[PDB]
């Protein structure tokens, strides 16, 4: 919770901020769906919100799990995009269209 003035631009890469905060709210958002399975499945919902299910799935699999594989920040950034690829823009909206328009 201290790294505001840690996150930085072309320095530690500008876009990282909002990208983080994409996946931030997005991850947690998908944990919202997570349970409600016994309710109507999670197949009876609507698609968009369902998409955040897939968000998780890849989040835990790809993004988190990394065995011992020495990752790299840049490789880590890749992930973001990919997972977000499950999603149209219009969900992708911390970020400005240029950046997602650079990472998709």
């Amino acid at each position: 919770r201290l790294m505001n003035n840690g996150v930085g631009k072309g320095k530690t890469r500008e876009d990282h901020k909002q990208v983080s905060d994409q996946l931030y709210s997005a991850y947690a958002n998908g944990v919202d769906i997570r349970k409600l399975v016994a309710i109507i499945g999670e197949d009876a919902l609507t698609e968009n919100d369902r998409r955040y299910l897939q968000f998780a799935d890849a989040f835990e699999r790809f993004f988190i799990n990394q065995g011992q594989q020495n990752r790299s920040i840049e490789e880590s950034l890749q992930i973001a995009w990919a997972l977000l690829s499950m999603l149209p823009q219009g969900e992708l909206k911390r970020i400005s269209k240029d950046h997602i328009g650079k990472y998709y």
């Binding site: 919202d32 349970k35 409600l36 309710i39 109507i40 009876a44």
Partner: protein, 210 residues
């Protein structure tokens, strides 16, 4: 009697909320969607119905035309080309919002059974009955959805309330009660220890002194 154990369970009862608090919240607005959504069907339900009720009413009233008097005749004279009554084939719609019966009473209501077109008003009018049957279904089936949609909401809130309005603060006050006693224990210790220090120090005053 039945109160605490007094102890360490604290942590579980701390966890009480974890379970409770977090789950239960969210459950409310889930179904809120569905009830919202219900309304489209309700709106549409009567739409054609009321319209085509008056375009029912045509035939009903055109009974009386040259066959008000032959309503008497007709009620025999046209009546039985088809099972009257039932064919109510009870349907489940199975959802959150359980299962209740709906149905299509899928047997025909018929209208042809007579030749020439016989007395005339009869056939077209009997044809109107279709437009009773069929039409009544829309509402028959949307309102059974209604009853589902009542239940949930009502039931729902009953628990919402409960959680909000007894559960949480009750268990809060438990912890506290516990805590406080546990905590106060510290003192007694100390209280003891104080005297102990007193001892050590008394020893050390009159074994070093004397």
């Amino acid at each position: 009697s039945q109160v605490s154990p007094t102890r360490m369970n604290l942590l579980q009862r701390r966890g009480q909320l974890r379970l409770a608090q977090k789950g239960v919240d969210l459950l409310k607005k889930k179904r809120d969607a569905l009830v919202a959504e219900f309304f489209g069907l309700v709106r549409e339900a009567m739409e054609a119905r009321k319209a085509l009720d008056q375009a029912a009413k045509e035939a009903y009233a055109a009974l009386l035309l040259a066959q008000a008097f032959d309503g008497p005749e007709v009620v025999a004279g046209a009546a039985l080309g088809v099972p009257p009554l039932e064919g109510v084939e009870a349907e489940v719609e199975n959802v959150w919002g359980s299962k209740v019966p709906r149905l299509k009473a899928t047997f025909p209501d018929g209208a042809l059974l007579s030749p020439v077109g016989t007395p005339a008003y009869t056939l077209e009018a009997s044809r109107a009955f279709r437009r009773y049957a069929e039409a009544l279904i829309r509402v028959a089936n949307t309102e059974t959805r209604l009853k589902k949609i009542g239940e949930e909401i009502k039931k729902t809130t009953r628990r919402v309330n409960a959680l909000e309005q007894v559960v949480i603060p009750g268990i809060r006050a438990q912890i506290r009660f516990i805590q406080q006693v546990l905590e106060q224990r510290e003192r007694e210790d100390t209280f003891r220890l104080k005297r102990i220090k007193g001892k050590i120090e008394a020893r050390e005053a009159e074994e070093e002194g004397g």
